[PDB]
């Protein structure tokens, strides 16, 4: 309605004193083998009706700044520039969905180049991340023509149909898992636990898995449905469905019947987190659950703080998912990336900021 408008007067002054190099989805997104990208959701019509104030600058292609109001020791307003050098800094206005393609392009190569090209989706509740990987891209009714996975699950058959890659006698195969309750449940069986061990070559060896073949870009979506048809875990009407399962979408590439693997993907879904202390456990059940998550997520960046550094030692064993993905952290031809999703709330700045603290341990470097 009418918050402090001078809040916005503080914002615009930094804007009209500098260059700004925006970034759109109409350019060749080059390759690095590693990154952490960004994409925010647009300001809603409601937030405008409530006069929500801008909080972001997009000064550059690989950097973003937050506009935090503060106060001094005489109640004088102060503004902070949260200078965050990152790799890819996309706007909420530029959502043409090529971000996935620009993220897929390096990865669509690797498995077909014989490598382990993985990813993760990281973001706050209501930050638009279910609109970012699970699809579809319309923002209205999730119209079943723009499945964001299908923008490279097309590639699974179309880049397969690449005559350069038609030479390779390769099979379609993949696997969905459930990292939850400190255990591994199958999304194909799909109520049973499996166990996973290593090889003399320090591979990974699942025990009792269903490996599914498909000639359908929707047949894999059926297994995402049938995979989600477990509808686990921790379901309620809270966060949001709260059916929080760290949903592994892993790929199994090899020849027709040779049993010899020529690469991998693993694209993983974040769980359903709880907004600080706003939730309630009221049970030793839930008091376990979020604790397991908030550790299991934290340890992930650590071996990446070992691998993205880069370093040598690597403790993949505190989390089973890193025991699943100890493989991925080792290959030289093994890409990785991860995505940030943001909400324009000013109350969200307390959490969209805690979002970004998690990815900073690459030791990015602002030269400004």
């Amino acid at each position: 309605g009418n918050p402090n408008w001078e809040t916005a007067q503080m914002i615009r002054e930094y804007q009209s004193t500098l260059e700004f190099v925006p970034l759109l989805d109409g350019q060749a997104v080059d390759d690095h083998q590693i990154t952490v990208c960004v994409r925010k959701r647009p300001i809603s019509r409601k937030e405008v009706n409530r006069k929500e104030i801008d909080v972001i600058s997009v000064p550059r292609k690989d950097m973003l700044i937050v506009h935090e109001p503060r106060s001094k020791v005489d109640l004088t307003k102060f503004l902070e520039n949260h200078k965050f050098r990152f790799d890819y800094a996309f706007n909420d206005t530029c959502d043409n969905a090529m971000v996935y393609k620009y993220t897929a392009k390096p990865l669509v190569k690797t498995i077909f180049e014989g490598g382990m090209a993985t990813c993760f989706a990281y973001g706050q509740t209501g930050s638009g991340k279910t609109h970012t990987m699970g699809g579809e891209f319309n923002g209205k009714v999730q119209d079943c023509k723009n499945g964001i996975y299908a923008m490279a699950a097309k590639d699974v058959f179309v880049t397969l149909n690449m005559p350069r890659y038609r030479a390779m006698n390769l099979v379609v195969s993949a696997s969905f898992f459930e990292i939850y309750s400190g255990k591994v449940f199958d999304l194909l069986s799909d109520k049973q636990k499996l166990r996973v061990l290593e090889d003399g070559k320090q591979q990974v060896q699942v025990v009792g898995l269903t490996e599914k073949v498909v000639d359908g870009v929707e047949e894999v979506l059926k297994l995402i449905q049938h995979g989600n048809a477990a509808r686990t875990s921790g379901q309620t009407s809270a966060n949001s469905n709260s059916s929080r399962s760290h949903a592994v979408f892993q790929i199994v590439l090899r020849p027709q019947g040779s049993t010899k693997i020529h690469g991998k993907f693993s694209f993983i879904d974040l769980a359903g987190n709880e907004r600080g202390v706003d939730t309630s456990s009221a049970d030793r059940q839930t008091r376990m659950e979020g604790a397991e998550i908030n550790k299991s997520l934290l340890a992930l960046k650590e071996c990446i703080r070992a691998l993205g550094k880069q370093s040598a030692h690597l403790p993949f064993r505190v989390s089973k998912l890193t025991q699943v993905l100890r493989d991925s952290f080792i290959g030289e031809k093994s890409k990785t990336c991860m995505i940030a999703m943001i909400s324009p709330g000013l109350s969200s700045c307390e959490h969209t900021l805690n979002t970004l603290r998690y990815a900073d341990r690459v030791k990015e470097l602002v030269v400004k």
Binding site: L197, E198, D199, G200, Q202, Q205, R284, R287, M288, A291, K295, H313, P315, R317, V318
Partner: protein, 429 residues
């Protein structure tokens, strides 16, 4: 208040408790019958932590004796305190593991664990609120190796957020009392890294050096070896039973003493330790005990602490003391020996002060350290392990019980990562 369930596995483990449960009852003043006849009432203030009440003024120790595979059983019943356990808690079977891991964890454990886990839930709901699961067993053997680790997989599953300590007697690097001793170490610790909060890694050779070099004893019997270990146990739960000016929960230890969720392998320590008649030529002070605690020949770990780096230590002090002397002696050690420690940790020592000593003494202490000097021990076992497996030595007593070759490769690389990620932190970084 919080209460503690006490579990015993292996032929070793209940023999530890058989002296140990005598110590606690003498710490409060309780007969073989359960009739309390202590001196003061201050020992009555936390009876509930181990002992629950019975009908006529009787106290029953909450001890679930899994390891009474029948030869070991009658000795416990025909002991000094066979008339103190509730006889329905003697949960056991027939024709035991036979120093086989798979006969402890895969075949006979499945014919006993349903009879065990129920009796766990019996004493569980008789408690107001739980934290304590003190498993007393050894590595290397049978029941303590396969049947011991089976409960720790299960009781963690029914109780995800409870304190899990296992005071496991480790193998010895020179005195090998078991031919299959590396094959029981690698498998059982592979459970322990996954599902323990802390453990008290104890060797017998360290107990051998302490009883002979320090206590000057001619013939140390296993009751006298374990009485050293029994001193560790009662010292740690001193503050959860007695009012202290700086208290010590198990969880207060189990947030301070562990930096990283995997590295929770502890070495204990105890002082005073002397050999005398009734005239001994010394004087008990705070720097008297302090120098004794940090001695390389006063470890129950069988390693040189000066070879590794202390990650963190725990000084749990008992008896009447003075905090400044306690503070500055812990200060002076971190000063004069700063090159020993992990340097990139601000404080490397914590304290804990109970206010009541044991019966005979006037002051006492309990050292608990966690070092990169225990990096030696698993290196002194995994090398013994990897010589047996390349020649594929004892496989037909294991593959014929329900195991697999891929299980052994999975087992050691768990242990290979600990010694690898102790080298990261013994290095000056």
């Amino acid at each position: 208040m919080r209460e503690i369930v006490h579990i015993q596995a292996g032929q070793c483990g209940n023999q530890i408790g058989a002296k140990f449960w005598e110590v606690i009852s003498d710490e409060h003043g309780i007969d073989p019958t359960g009739s309390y006849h202590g001196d003061s009432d201050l020992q009555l203030e936390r009876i509930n932590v181990y002992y629950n009440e019975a009908t006529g003024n009787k106290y029953v120790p909450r001890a679930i004796l899994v390891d009474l595979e029948p030869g070991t059983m009658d000795s416990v019943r025909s002991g000094p305190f066979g008339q103190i356990f509730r006889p329905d808690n003697f949960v056991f079977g027939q024709s035991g593991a036979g120093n086989n891991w798979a006969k402890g964890h895969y075949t006979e454990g499945a014919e006993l664990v349903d009879s065990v886990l129920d009796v766990v839930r019996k004493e569980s709901e008789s408690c107001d609120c739980l934290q304590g699961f003190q498993l007393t067993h050894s590595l290397g053997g049978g029941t303590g190796s396969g049947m011991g680790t089976l409960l720790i997989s299960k009781i963690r599953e029914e109780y995800p957020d409870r304190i899990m300590n296992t005071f496991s007697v480790m193998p010895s690097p020179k005195v090998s009392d078991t031919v299959v001793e590396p094959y029981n170490a690698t498998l059982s610790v592979h459970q322990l890294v996954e599902n323990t909060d802390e453990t008290y890694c104890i060797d017998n050779e360290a107990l051998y050096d302490i009883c002979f070099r320090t206590l000057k004893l001619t013939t140390p019997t296993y009751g006298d070896l374990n009485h050293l270990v029994s001193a560790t146990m009662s010292g740690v739960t001193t503050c959860l039973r007695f009012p202290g000016q700086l208290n010590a929960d198990l969880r207060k230890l189990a947030v301070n003493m562990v930096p990283f969720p995997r590295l929770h392998f502890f070495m204990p320590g105890f002082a005073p330790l002397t050999s005398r008649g009734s005239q001994q030529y010394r004087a008990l002070t705070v720097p008297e005990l302090t120098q004794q605690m940090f001695d390389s020949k006063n470890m129950m770990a069988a390693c040189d602490p000066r070879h590794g780096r202390y990650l963190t230590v725990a000084a749990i002090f008992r008896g009447r003391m003075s905090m400044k002397e306690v503070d500055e002696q812990m200060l002076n050690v971190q000063n004069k020996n700063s090159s020993y420690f992990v340097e990139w940790i601000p404080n490397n020592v914590k304290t804990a002060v109970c206010d009541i000593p044991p019966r005979g003494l006037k002051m006492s202490a309990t050292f608990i350290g966690n070092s990169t000097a225990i990096q030696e021990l698993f290196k002194r076992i995994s090398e013994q392990f990897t010589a047996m497996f390349r020649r594929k030595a004892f496989l037909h007593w294991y593959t014929g019980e329900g195991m697999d070759e891929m299980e052994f490769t999975e087992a050691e690389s768990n242990m290979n990562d600990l010694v690898s990620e102790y080298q990261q932190y013994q290095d000056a970084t």
